[PDB]
Design a binder for this molecule. Sequence first.
Ligand SMILES: [Cl-]
Ligand SMILES: [Cl-]
Ligand SMILES: [Cl-]
Length: 163
Amino acid sequence: GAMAPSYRVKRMDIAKNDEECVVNAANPRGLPGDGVCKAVYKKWPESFKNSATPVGTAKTVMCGTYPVIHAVGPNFSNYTESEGDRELAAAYREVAKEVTRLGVNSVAIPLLSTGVYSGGKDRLTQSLNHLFTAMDSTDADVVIYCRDKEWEKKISEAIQMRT
Ligand SMILES: [Cl-]
Ligand SMILES: [Cl-]
Ligand SMILES: [Cl-]
């Protein structure tokens, strides 16, 4: 575990993370996709061997010895608010099981279902709170990766409010 498990946020490409493993914002079919998933495909293409996995689950595939945890958040276009909420919470619970199983001391995570799967809605708070619910019981250092300057500030504020 980390000596003093923390949350941090950085505004940069998750493919340039400084952590012991990465969470992909995957699609259920293990396709290269767009956004985080396309950056992850360019950096760790070997990790997409048999990565397909249903909505609300996580499947880890090794790129060398570097673990890529494919986490499949719901597409809020296709899901109701209620069912989407349940699957988004579940995806993060499966990420917490994988991070624990791998025995890593740190993980790079994106906010699931906040990009092209958001159904056109701002889901920073919803996705972040499900991330916290899952990861709070883990002792990995969690580093959240975002690209928008205003999201960095809001994620930083939410982390600092609980410290
Ligand atoms: Cl960058
Ligand atoms: Cl997304
Ligand atoms: Cl962002």
